[PDB]
Amino acid sequence: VNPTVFFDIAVDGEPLGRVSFELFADKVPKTAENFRALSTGEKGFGYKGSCFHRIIPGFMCQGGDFTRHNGTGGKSIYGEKFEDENFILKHTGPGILSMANAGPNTNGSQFFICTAKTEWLDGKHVVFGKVKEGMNIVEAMERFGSRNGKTSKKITIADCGQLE
Amino acid sequence: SMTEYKLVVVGADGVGKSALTIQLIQNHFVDEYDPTIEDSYRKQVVIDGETSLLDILDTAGQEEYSAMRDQYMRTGEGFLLVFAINNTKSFEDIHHYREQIKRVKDSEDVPMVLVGNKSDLPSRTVDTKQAQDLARSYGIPFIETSAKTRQGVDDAFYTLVREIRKHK
Numbered sequence: 001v002n003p004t005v006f007f008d009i010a011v012d013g014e015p016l017g018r019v020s021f022e023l024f025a026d027k028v029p030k031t032a033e034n035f036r037a038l039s040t041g042e043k044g045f046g047y048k049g050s051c052f053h054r055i056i057p058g059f060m061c062q063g064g065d066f067t068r069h070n071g072t073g074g075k076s077i078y079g080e081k082f083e084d085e086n087f088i089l090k091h092t093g094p095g096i097l098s099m100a101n102a103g104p105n106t107n108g109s110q111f112f113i114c115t116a117k118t119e120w121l122d123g124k125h126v127v128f129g130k131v132k133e134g135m136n137i138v139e140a141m142e143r144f145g146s147r148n149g150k151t152s153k154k155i156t157i158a159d160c161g162q163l164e
Numbered sequence: 165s166m167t168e169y170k171l172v173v174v175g176a177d178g179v180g181k182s183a184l185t186i187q188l189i190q191n192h193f194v195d196e197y198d199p200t201i202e203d204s205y206r207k208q209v210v211i212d213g214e215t216s217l218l219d220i221l222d223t224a225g226q227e228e229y230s231a232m233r234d235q236y237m238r239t240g241e242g243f244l245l246v247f248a249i250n251n252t253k254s255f256e257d258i259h260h261y262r263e264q265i266k267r268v269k270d271s272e273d274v275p276m277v278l279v280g281n282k283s284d285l286p287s288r289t290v291d292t293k294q295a296q297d298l299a300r301s302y303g304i305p306f307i308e309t310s311a312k313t314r315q316g317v318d319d320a321f322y323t324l325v326r327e328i329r330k331h332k
């Protein structure tokens with residue numbers, strides 16, 4: 001039974017709304033479990049309080065750097081990085097949740113949510129979840145982005161956790 | 165009003181394109197890796213007694229998007245071809261960048277400067293003579309740089325401005 005997690009998103013501190021995600025533990029359990037644990041904060045660190053640092057309309061919203069808060073950091077629950085678990089799942093369209101990386105076997109905590117199909121990322125980024133509720137929140141985040149991804153307001157994960 | 169020069173910094177991922185540019189613009193050194201999508205900067209400088217406005221385009225090193233370089237190569241007036249002196253692959257990549265610029269601009273005569281960056285590191289795999297010989301075969305200057313120590317940073321950008329001036 002795949003776990004569900006939520007982000008409550010804020011924009012310059014004002015509430016925007018909740019996005020929830022199904023995590024495909026049935027296909028990518030190690031990668032799903034990393035995102036789950038980081039969403040609950042149960043290791044003493046995680047996504048709460050961190051920003052979506054890169055938003056590119058037409059493509060994706062990227063976030064998850066809770067260690068440096070500048071887009072360069074993050075870490076997994078397994079160590080700073082972990083290997084690509086599999087590439088079974090594809091970037092098929094809006095709402096796909098997939099790991100950011102800096103090349104093979106460099107998954108940390110950064111992730112991205114597709115707002116379109118991004119098939120050229122297939123086989124390079126591990127897909128491990130999908131938006132379940134609140135895709136309209138992700139759509140509304142897009143207008144705070146730009147061509148190179150710089151955001152015009154601070155888009156933050158004000159709260160996050162696991163739904164029962 | 166001062167002349168504007170459209171400079172473009174190209175080269176394989178991680179060679180220090182951004183570190184060099186941020187050193188020029190902000191006078192400090194980024195030790196963390198923030199892979200570039202695309203960034204643009206402006207700085208006025210004085211070169212050979214003439215005040216010039218530098219418009220710098222700092223480009224992505226991702227090979228995946230090699231097909232999308234054509235538009236900024238068409239627009240750019242001069243190119244820094246950057247490799248890292250401890251990364252023989254990035255040196256090998258230089259040829260592809262130069263050939264791509266020549267093709268897109270349809271000219272044998274495009275202002276370019278070869279930049280061998282990370283000169284501060286002990287782990288050198290590209291001999292200075294190899295780089296120098298390659299530059300001479302291209303007919304372009306070669307500048308050795310460190311974004312970390314600032315060695316050669318101004319020289320690389322200023323030499324490229326000088327190359328554009330000769331071309332115009």
Ligand SMILES: CCn1c(-c2cc(N3CCN(C)CC3)cnc2[C@H](C)OC)c2c3cc(ccc31)-c1csc(n1)C[C@H](NC(=O)[C@H]1C[C@@H]1C)C(=O)N1CCC[C@H](N1)C(=O)OCC(C)(C)C2
Pocket residue numbers: 054056059060062071072073099100101102110111112118120121125147148149197198199200201202224226229232
């Ligand atoms: C050519 C200009 N460009 C473009 C690009 C590509 C297209 N098309 C390609 C597909 N065809 C079919 C249509 C045209 C059109 N328009 C642009 C942009 C809008 O032109 C300005 C991209 C891109 C990505 C990188 C560099 C330059 C880049 C890059 C630079 S590091 C990277 N990717 C991977 C990135 N690692 C990190 O952050 C590491 C540091 C952390 C730990 C990462 O895991 N993720 C998650 C997946 C998405 C990716 N970031 C990202 O941001 O993708 C941006 C996107 C727009 C999707 C692609």
Ligand SMILES: Nc1nc2c(ncn2[C@@H]2O[C@H](COP(=O)(O)OP(=O)(O)NP(=O)(O)O)[C@@H](O)[C@H]2O)c(=O)[nH]1
Pocket residue numbers: 175176177178179180181182183184194195196197198199200201223224225226281282283284285309310311312313
């Ligand atoms: N020691 C040393 N490190 C350097 C130097 N130039 C860059 N670096 C380091 O090399 C890494 C990559 O640098 P960066 O400027 O991001 O390279 P890039 O060419 O812009 N990479 P991209 O193509 O992804 O945008 C960073 O850790 C940076 O600190 C240098 O001259 N010396």
Ligand SMILES: [Mg+2]
Pocket residue numbers: 181182183198199200222223224225
């Ligand atoms: Mg860069």
